[PDB]
Design a protein around this ligand. Structure first.
Ligand SMILES: Nc1nc2c(ncn2[C@@H]2O[C@H](COP(=O)(O)OP(=O)(O)OP(=O)(O)O)[C@@H](O)[C@H]2O)c(=O)[nH]1
Ligand SMILES: Nc1nc2c(ncn2[C@@H]2O[C@H](COP(=O)(O)OP(=O)(O)O)[C@@H](O)[C@H]2O)c(=O)[nH]1
Ligand SMILES: [Ca+2]
Ligand SMILES: [Mg+2]
Lengths: 437, 155, 431
């Protein structure tokens, strides 16, 4: 048992972290006040769920989570929500003035007024761990705090926890729910400064989740509530191997071994199936071969890109529910022959399979229907470079005219950092081009 | 010298001082450093009575300063409708051109004196007159988007 | 980002400023005495932005009233919400500025500005998280223009990290045919480009033409014009006075609206247009509000937006309407009018929907645009300024108060550079 500390930065990271911990408690059978009746040992244990929850003397299970934001509006909802008694109150840290969608405010000026307080609170959770293995960092790309403060936090965590792993859950900006025009700037800036401090980053394209909510869930105008309930359902499938017994991705190091062949191209693509509306409670239960074929449809991916236009470097299939292992092998053998799926020449064209025999849990009030079996595919494909290309183009259109740049240099930031960050993004695109022969 | 005193009395609107100075031989057509006559300053500062008194005592209604401004230029610019009509009644060149190519119609149109624009049009204001930059009174209304002025220039 | 300190200078500033408090208090359910009479909880969640909580549930506007003319002082108390203002926040001199920018900025107003800063510091320290300052004034006068810009420079040098926002009214011969107003406006624009983060241009030329030609009012009065101003000031501040996520504070609005520091002059627009006699004006549809919002007849600045390009645009919809339908129409007008938006600022149109419509209306649309077409407004003042300045007309009114005549050439040169800068990005392409 190796503990994992989750860090939620900004409104996107806090609200998504709020939905994830609500789902974690339902999966593990943890009451909103922290009591777990099926927990045999009281006051401390060594089970798999202890990696995400610590235990107090009175049987209370407290998440190993930190919530940080430069303004208190969003975190105050966690302090008064259904799970208000679940988190350590000192793990809910808020400032008074936010970063105003400015990377420089979150990283240089406003962000430095609270960075040391966050590290001391993280150190308090880290001292309660017998074997800390790393951190899960939730944040957005376009927000000032989600981009500026996160890159500042990742730099400091590499100093105090150099050997520990660092995994991101990043929110890729989408124009349908974008709140700022300078989000392409903040996305390229925080990617350049965090690229060397993050071992594995799972991008969540808000546009991809937005379309899935409209198509598969029949939601006319999706909101953050609908997006976060589907995002948390995918984050739960990714982190299920850390919270339950299993054989695939049992620790944060194995994520890099199975998904990150080279440290710069550490952006896996996630795919979830099936996404069935709760209005169709009597739907036809899909087979293992059906949900496995759905993992290669571009309409089910968390990032808008075409994997048929790229080559695979790794591929992990995480199953949950009534899934017989022989049906997985048959479904994979058909896919290796039927679909034109191309691996790179230097990787063993195989599939890592991990099965959790408990069906996925649905949140009461959610938009998802109960399913007997689901699958989350984690794959490192070069086709995800299309996502970087769309961001870099929007960056290049504004930076050529130097639009909005004065907001960044006015908050203590050299203008040359824009070109340094942009050049690093150009090098990242070539890394994908040099692999996809 | 009574020329400098007549200039100041015309600018300040001292009617009695103007009449006394002229009776003592003050030069009605005296000029300052820029060539402004007492009629220029009276027409600029809206002293209608002094304008009429000067015109009855040999004031040149078409005098120009260094920049070629007549009293009608300044009266149309500042917007003194009563003085504009009095000047035109005493032979003011309605189409006088200054060093910037501006006619009194130009200045009246730029400053939005629509009543003075009408009065100048009734006295032969050339709507085809171009300034130093080729603009006419009509061009100024179209460029500034002043529909009220553009209607007046069409009659 | 919470409290906002409101300041109103001059006759026009107090005129539109008092009408501003009369309109938003009605929206928040605050009577002239200061008690909350609203029947919706949404009216008090963001009430601390413009009001201070006093005694027995009494809300007092965080407003400062300044004018060199003591006459307009008693004119505010004679109004509806006259007594709701704090008596300590009345800073009034002895004699009016006489439409002289030099008197308000260098002599008369320079004496009273120290008394105003004390009232600002008193209100500023009484704030938990101060956003910035908003100012209402005219540019054609002497107090609101001369002393207003002086008060801005003195405030920005003590609170530099705060946002400076102004509601500046532009002179027009159709409203006030005083020929020194181009002087006062040009000298003020030179100050606003350097010391303000956001400036809403409220053109009296546009207000008159809307009342005369659109509203069919033969003789428009200042009350008819200020009716359009208060309706606009209520719309542009909706996202600040109600819970929301799009441009919820002065800084996040500026970061989304101001791509270049000098180009921070906004072209506001409102729909539908009312004439103080709405009678039974039916609620327009979302496509009608979207089309009428980008109409040249609905802009509060005498500019044709079809003559320039939108750098950034913020749209505020108020009332009960379909969120999905608003997204369709906004994405529709951006394709029909595709050539009127710069292509090197992606997603430069942000939309916010507020559930509470203004008084007397069920469907309203407020338009905040950073358009290069605003150069037509500055060109109009520059031509009137040049016509006067070339003849040196009435120049001694200003040089007799300490002004150097080179300040006129600097204000003229700085404003011409502003026009050429708008034309620079109106013709720039993404190659
Ligand atoms: N999926 C999802 N995305 C969100 C959510 N909240 C914000 N976002 C996205 O995050 C981006 C803006 O970042 P924010 O998190 O809101 O800003 P911030 O991190 O709080 O930083 P500040 O600028 O200081 O407010 C936008 O593009 C939103 O689409 C959320 O609850 N769910
Ligand atoms: N829209 C509007 N404009 C005004 C009002 N009062 C004055 N103005 C304009 O402001 C200019 C005069 O400035 P004013 O505020 O009266 O002088 P100040 O006291 O020195 O600031 C004129 O061009 C008027 O058109 C008003 O109540 N509403
Ligand atoms: Ca235990
Ligand atoms: Mg935030």
């Amino acid at each position: 048992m190796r503990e994992c500390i989750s860090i939620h930065v900004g409104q996107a990271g806090v609200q998504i972290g709020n939905a994830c911990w609500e789902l974690y408690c339902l999966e593990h059978g943890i009451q909103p006040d922290g009591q777990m009746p099926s927990d045999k040992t009281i006051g401390g244990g060594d089970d798999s769920f202890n990696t995400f929850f610590s235990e107090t003397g009175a049987g209370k299970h407290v998440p190993r989570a930190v919530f940080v934001d430069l303004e208190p509006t969003v975190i105050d909802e966690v302090r008064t929500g259904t799970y208000r008694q679940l988190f350590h109150p000192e793990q809910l840290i808020t400032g008074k003035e936010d970063a105003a969608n400015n990377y420089a405010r979150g990283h240089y000026t406003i962000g430095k007024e609270i960075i040391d307080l966050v590290l001391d609170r993280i150190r308090k959770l880290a001292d309660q761990c017998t074997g800390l293995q790393g951190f899960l960092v939730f944040h957005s790309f376009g927000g000032g705090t989600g981009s500026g403060f996160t890159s500042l936090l990742m730099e400091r965590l590499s100093v105090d926890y150099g050997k520990k792993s660092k995994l991101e859950f990043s929110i890729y900006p989408a124009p349908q729910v974008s709140t700022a025009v300078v989000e392409p700037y903040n996305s390229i800036l925080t990617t350049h400064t965090t690229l060397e401090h993050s071992d594995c980053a799972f991008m969540v394209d808000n546009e991809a989740i937005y379309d899935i909510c409209r198509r598969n869930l029949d939601i006319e105008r999706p909101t953050y509530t609908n997006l976060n309930r589907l995002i948390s359902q995918i984050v739960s499938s990714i982190t299920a191997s850390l919270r339950f017994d299993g054989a695939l991705n049992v620790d944060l190091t194995e994520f890099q071994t199975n998904l990150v062949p080279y440290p710069r191209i550490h952006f896996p693509l996630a795919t979830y199936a099936p996404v069935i509306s709760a209005e169709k409670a009597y739907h036809e239960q899909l087979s293992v071969a059906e949900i496995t074929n759905a993992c290669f449809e571009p309409a089910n991916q968390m990032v808008k890109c075409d994997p048929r236009h790229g080559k695979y470097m790794a591929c992990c299939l995480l199953y949950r529910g009534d899934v017989v292992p022989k049906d997985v092998n048959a479904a994979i053998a058909t896919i290796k022959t039927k679909r034109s799926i191309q691996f790179v020449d230097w990787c063993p064209t195989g599939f890592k399979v991990g099965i959790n025999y408990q069906p996925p849990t649905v949140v009461p009030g959610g938009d998802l229907a109960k399913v007997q079996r689901a699958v989350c595919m984690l794959s490192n494909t070069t086709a995800i470079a299309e996502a970087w290309a769309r961001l870099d183009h929007k960056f290049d259109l504004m930076y050529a005219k130097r639009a909005f740049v004065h907001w960044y240099v006015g908050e203590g930031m050299e203008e040359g950092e824009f070109s340094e960050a942009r050049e690093d993004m150009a090098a990242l695109e070539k890394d994908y081009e040099e692999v996809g022969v | 010298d009574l020329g400098k005193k007549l200039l100041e009395a015309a600018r300040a609107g001292q009617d009695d001082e103007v009449r006394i100075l002229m009776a003592n031989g003050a030069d009605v057509n005296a000029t300052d450093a820029s060539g402004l006559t007492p009629l220029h300053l009276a027409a600029t500062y809206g002293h209608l009575e002094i304008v009429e008194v000067l015109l009855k005592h040999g004031a040149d209604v078409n005098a120009i300063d260094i920049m070629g401004s007549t009293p009608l230029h300044l009266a149309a610019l500042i917007g003194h409708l009563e003085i504009v009509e009095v000047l035109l009644k005493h032979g003011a060149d309605v189409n006088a051109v200054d060093t910037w190519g501006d006619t009194p119609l130009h200045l009246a149109a730029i400053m939005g004196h629509l009543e003075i624009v009408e009065v100048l049009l009734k006295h032969g204001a050339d709507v085809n007159a171009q300034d130093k930059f080729g603009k006419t009174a009509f061009d100024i209304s179209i460029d500034n988007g002043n529909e009220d002025l553009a209607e007046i220039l069409q009659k | 980002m919470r409290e906002i300190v409101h300041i109103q200078a001059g006759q026009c500033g107090n005129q539109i400023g008092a009408k501003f408090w009369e309109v938003i208090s009605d929206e928040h359910g605050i009577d002239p005495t200061g008690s909350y009479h609203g029947d919706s909880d949404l009216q008090l969640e963001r009430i601390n932005v413009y009001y201070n909580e006093a005694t027995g549930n009494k809300y007092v506007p965080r407003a400062i009233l300044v004018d060199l003319e003591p006459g307009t002082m008693d004119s505010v108390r004679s109004g509806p919400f006259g007594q709701i203002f704090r008596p300590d926040n009345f800073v009034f001199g002895q004699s009016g500025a006489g439409n002289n920018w030099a008197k308000g900025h260098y002599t008369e107003g320079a004496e009273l500005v120290d008394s105003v800063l004390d009232v600002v510091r008193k209100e500023s320290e009484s704030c938990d998280c101060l956003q910035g300052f908003q100012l209402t004034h005219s540019l054609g006068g002497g107090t609101g223009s001369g002393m207003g810009t002086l008060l801005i420079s003195k405030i920005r040098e003590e609170y530099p990290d705060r946002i400076m926002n102004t509601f500046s009214v532009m002179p027009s011969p159709k409203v006030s045919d005083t020929v020194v107003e181009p002087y006062n406006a040009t000298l003020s624009v030179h100050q606003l480009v350097e010391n303000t983060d956001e400036t809403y241009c409220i053109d009296n030329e546009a207000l008159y033409d809307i009342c005369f030609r659109t509203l069919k009012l033969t003789t428009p009065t200042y009350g008819d014009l200020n009716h359009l101003v208060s309706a606009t000031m209520s719309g542009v501040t909706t996202c600040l006075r109600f819970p929301g996520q799009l441009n919820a504070d002065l800084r996040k609005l500026a970061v989304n609206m101001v791509p270049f520091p000098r180009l921070h002059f906004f072209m506001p627009g409102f729909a539908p247009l009312t004439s103080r006699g709405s009678q039974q004006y039916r609620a327009l549809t979302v496509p009608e509000l979207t089309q009428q919002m980008f109409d040249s007849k609905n802009m509060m600045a005498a500019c044709d937006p079809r003559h320039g390009r939108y750098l950034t645009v913020a749209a505020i919809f108020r009332g009960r309407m379909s969120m999905k339908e608003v997204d369709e129409q906004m994405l529709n007008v951006q394709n029909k009018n595709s050539s009127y938006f710069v292509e090197w600022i992606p997603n430069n149109v942000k939309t916010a929907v507020c559930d509470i419509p203004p008084r007397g209306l069920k469907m309203s649309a407020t338009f905040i645009g950073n358009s290069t077409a605003i150069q037509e407004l500055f060109k109009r003042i520059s031509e009137q300024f040049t016509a006067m300045f070339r003849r040196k007309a009435f120049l001694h009114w200003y040089t007799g108060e300490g002004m150097d005549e080179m300040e006129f050439t600097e204000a003229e040169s700085n404003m011409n550079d502003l026009v050429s800068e708008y034309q620079q990005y109106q013709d720039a392409t993404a190659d």
